Amino acid sequence: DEYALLTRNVERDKYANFTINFTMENQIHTGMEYDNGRFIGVKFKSVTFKDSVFKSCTFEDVTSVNTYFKNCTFIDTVFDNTDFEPYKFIDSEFKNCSFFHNK
Amino acid sequence: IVNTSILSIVYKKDDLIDLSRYGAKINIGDRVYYDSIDKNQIKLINLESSTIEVILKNAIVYNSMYENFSTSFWIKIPKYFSKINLNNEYTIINCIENNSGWKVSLNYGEIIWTLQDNKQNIQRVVFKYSQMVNISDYINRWIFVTITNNRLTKSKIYINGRLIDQKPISNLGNIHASNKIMFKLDGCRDPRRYIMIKYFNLFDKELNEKEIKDLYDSQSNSGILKDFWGNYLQYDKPYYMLNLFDPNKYVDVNNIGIRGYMYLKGPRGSVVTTNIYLNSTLYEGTKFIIKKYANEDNIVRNNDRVYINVVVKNKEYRLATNASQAGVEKILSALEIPDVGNLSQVVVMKSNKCKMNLQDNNGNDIGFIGFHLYDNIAKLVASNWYNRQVGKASRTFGCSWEFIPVDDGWGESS
């Protein structure tokens, strides 16, 4: 007792109500929250998401290579016509998410 | 056998009433809801004002060691969506007083019957259903529950006429149940939780297997077509289509016009909450709308004559064919509704396995709607072989359908 655990409770950078097409490459994204984000026709090349939250997002017509989601959370999110196999999701959680047309 | 009933609750003229000879008093809370379309369907939500309290006459209050009794009701339980629904048994029908009596409770994927004598001994029988299934018979669909108790033998629980679980209860002393039955979500930690229930009954005997199936069948409302959830099939309501020969497929349209066709396509997608549920997506494919042609109340009944609209790119089209195609199978097309002209489009709905019978305008059978495989494309067809097979009581494949409307107890995105 008396000696407590030192854990940062840091709020996530929040981005919302956007559409993204750019085939973004070679990136790392940590502590991010994407709300009502649309990823349409996106080539993820060598990108990773760490401790990020996706809420009410759509991935549609997406491809990914050397791309991973580590300890992320997905909520009310649709993956339509994507190439996302489980192994791309490390220690992640889905709540009320939909997958369609997975190649 | 709904005559043996010591308590039979039904809707009537803006009220719940007991039809039994004991006219129990029924106190209704402030946030109780009923289905404008099937008024006997009652919804209770997770608030203290969503209550139905039945006060039994003292003559029928249960206080015995030996007397047999049963109960039955229909229930629709929405899917469990979150980890908050785990290990949280909540009472929904309570007839316990001073820690003796009976109750019906729910938990994640469970229906539970509990008996408790006045020494606090307990017996439970449980119906368990999986949420890790592509297409469930039970999640968010009306099912018939019946529980029977023989004080010298076993407690038993049936789902849709079928015995699930049975447990000896002779170890149980006197049971002194409450004189109130409280219909209420009690102890449930999920605020969005609700249940729907209809035709609750109590009986002062052990129903046998035959009486149970007879209740199941008559309360089915066999002349009214039902959608996938068990609700009354309705005109002017969009429905995703499911073909029971292969429910891992949905209906799509390659093109509008008499050159196009509808067809079956798979696989279905998936809806998932990690460790809570993993099911097939039901809101996939082109929706069908039933349109009137034939008992004026918006409910679809056995042998009604309808048109079927099909929804493509959120525009409504007409299901139709020309019977003059060679072959018995007439491929179906989605037509612009003004341009349908003389093509066959009149459909006789039927509730018992083939569901849609297409006719020409002279009243003649084109055939039941199902599918035919042409070069590995399952095209929808009207085919009189189906009609001839049902006569022979022969095996049919593909003429059995379910209509799936959007529903808040299923919870899939839009």
Pair (B80, B38) in one structural domain: yes
How many alpha carbons lie under 13 Å from residue B358 in its C-beta half-sphere? 29
Total domains in chain A come to: 1
Which of A98, A101, A102 shows the shortest C-beta gap to B413? Answer: A98
Of B206, B227, B248, the residue at which a domain comes to its end is B227
Classify residue B399 as left (phi > 0), alpha (psi -120 to 50) or beta: alpha
Name the experiment that determined this structure.
Answer: X-ray
In sequence order, which residues have a C-beta less than 8 Å from that of residue A9 and are 6 or more positions away? none
* Chain A touched by B406 (CB under 8 Å): no
For residue B72, give the H/E element and its range: strand B69-76
d(CA B212, CA B160): 9
Pair (B200, B84) in one structural domain: yes
* Chain A touched by B298 (CB under 8 Å): no
Query: Are A76 and B413 in contact (CB < 8 Å)?
Result: yes
* Chain A touched by B269 (CB under 8 Å): yes
Domain CATH for A47: 2.160.20.80
The alpha-carbon gap from A84 to the nearest alpha carbon of chain B, in Å, equals: 13
Among residues A89, A75, A94, A69, the alpha carbon closest in space to that of B275 is found at: A94
In sequence order, which residues have a C-beta less than 8 Å from that of residue A59 and are 6 or more positions away? A39, A42, A77, A78, A79, A80, A82, A84
Look up residue B337 and give its two tokens.
């509704």
d(CA A60, CA A40): 5
d(CA B82, CA B84): 5
Domain CATH for B215: 2.60.120.200
Resolution value in angstroms: 2.3
Amino acid at B385: W
Pair (B134, B262) in one structural domain: no
The alpha-carbon gap from A31 to the nearest alpha carbon of chain B, in Å, equals: 21
Which of B82, B270, B281 shows the shortest C-beta gap to A95? Answer: B82
The alpha-carbon gap from B132 to the nearest alpha carbon of chain A, in Å, equals: 14
Pair (B337, B383) in one structural domain: yes
Residues B151 and B169: beta-carbon distance below 8 Å: yes
The alpha-carbon gap from A79 to the nearest alpha carbon of chain B, in Å, equals: 10
Pair (B206, B264) in one structural domain: no
d(CA B223, CA B230): 13
d(CA B37, CA A94): 35
d(CA B104, CA B85): 17
Look up residue B63 and give its two tokens.
């206080």
Pair (B85, B128) in one structural domain: yes
Pair (B223, B342) in one structural domain: no
Phi, psi for B313 (deg, rounded to 5): 40, 45
DSSP for residue B212: H
Residues B51 and B183: beta-carbon distance below 8 Å: yes
Of B193, B212, B227, the residue at which a domain comes to its end is B227
Which residues in B lie closer than 8 A to residue A99 (C-beta atoms)? 269-270, 272
Partners of B103 in the β-ladder: B94, B114
Among residues B228, B278, B232, the alpha carbon closest in space to that of B250 is found at: B228
Residue ranges with strand state E in B77-179? 90-97, 100-107, 110-116, 122-128, 143-149, 154-159, 162-168, 175-176
Residue ranges with strand state E in B260-395? 262-265, 270-273, 277-280, 288-292, 305-312, 315-320, 330-331, 333-335, 346-349, 356-359, 365-374, 377-383
d(CA A7, CA A4): 9
d(CA A72, CA B257): 46
* Chain A touched by B414 (CB under 8 Å): no
Pair (B222, B297) in one structural domain: no
Look up residue A59 and give its two tokens.
């991935």
Query: Are B281 and A100 in contact (CB < 8 Å)?
Result: yes
Q: How far is CA B360 from CA B100, B153, B176, B321, in A?
A: 64, 59, 64, 9
Pair (B218, B233) in one structural domain: no
Look up residue A55 and give its two tokens.
């809420």
User: Dihedral through CA B280, CA B282, CA B283, CA B285, nearest 10?
Assistant: 90
DSSP-based three-state secondary structure for A101: coil
* Chain B touched by A75 (CB under 8 Å): no
d(CA B47, CA B191): 8
Structural domain span for residue A70: 1-103
In sequence order, which residues have a C-beta less than 8 Å from that of residue B268 and are 6 or more positions away? B134, B247, B248, B249, B250, B280, B281, B282, B284
Amino acid at B70: S
Structural domain span for residue B9: 1-227
By C-alpha distance, the chain B residue nearest A57 is: B413
d(CA B188, CA B85): 8
Query: Are B284 and A94 in contact (CB < 8 Å)?
Result: no
Cis-peptide into B191, omega within 30 deg: no
Q: How far is CA A46 from CA A21, A26, A64, B282, in A?
A: 16, 5, 8, 34
In sequence order, which residues have a C-beta less than 8 Å from that of residue B378 and are 6 or more positions away? B249, B263, B264, B265, B371, B372, B398
Look up residue B342 and give its two tokens.
């003389």
d(CA B206, CA B147): 9
DSSP-based three-state secondary structure for B213: helix
d(CA B177, CA B98): 9
Please identify which residue in the block is written with the tokens 């008996």: B115
Among residues B342, B292, B299, B297, the alpha carbon closest in space to that of B321 is found at: B342
* Contact residues, B window 61-100, toward A, CB-based 8 Å cutoff: 81-82
Phi, psi for B16 (deg, rounded to 5): -100, 140
Amino acid at A82: T
Query: Are A99 and B412 in contact (CB < 8 Å)?
Result: no
Which of A76, A94, A100 shows the shortest C-beta gap to B274? Answer: A94
d(CA B223, CA B225): 6
Largest CA distance in chain A: 54
d(CA B92, CA B94): 6
For residue B199, give the H/E element and its range: strand B194-203
The alpha-carbon gap from A19 to the nearest alpha carbon of chain B, in Å, equals: 18
Positions of chain breaks in chain A, given as the residue before each break (C to N > 2.5 Å)? none
Pair (B221, B303) in one structural domain: no
Pair (B89, B174) in one structural domain: yes
d(CA B118, CA A50): 56
Pair (B345, B411) in one structural domain: yes
Chain mean position to CA A49: 6
Which residues in A lie closer than 8 A to residue B131 (C-beta atoms)? none
* Chain A touched by B409 (CB under 8 Å): no
Total domains in chain B come to: 2
Partners of A54 in the β-ladder: A34, A74
Q: How far from each other are the two terminal CA atoms of chain A, in whole angstroms? A: 53
Q: How many CB atoms lie within 10 A of CB B187?
A: 11
Of B227, B260, B275, the residue at which a domain comes to its end is B227
Query: Are B281 and A78 in contact (CB < 8 Å)?
Result: no
Query: Are B273 and A97 in contact (CB < 8 Å)?
Result: yes
In sequence order, which residues have a C-beta less than 8 Å from that of residue B376 and are 6 or more positions away? none
Please identify which residue in the block is written with the tokens 């048994």: B89
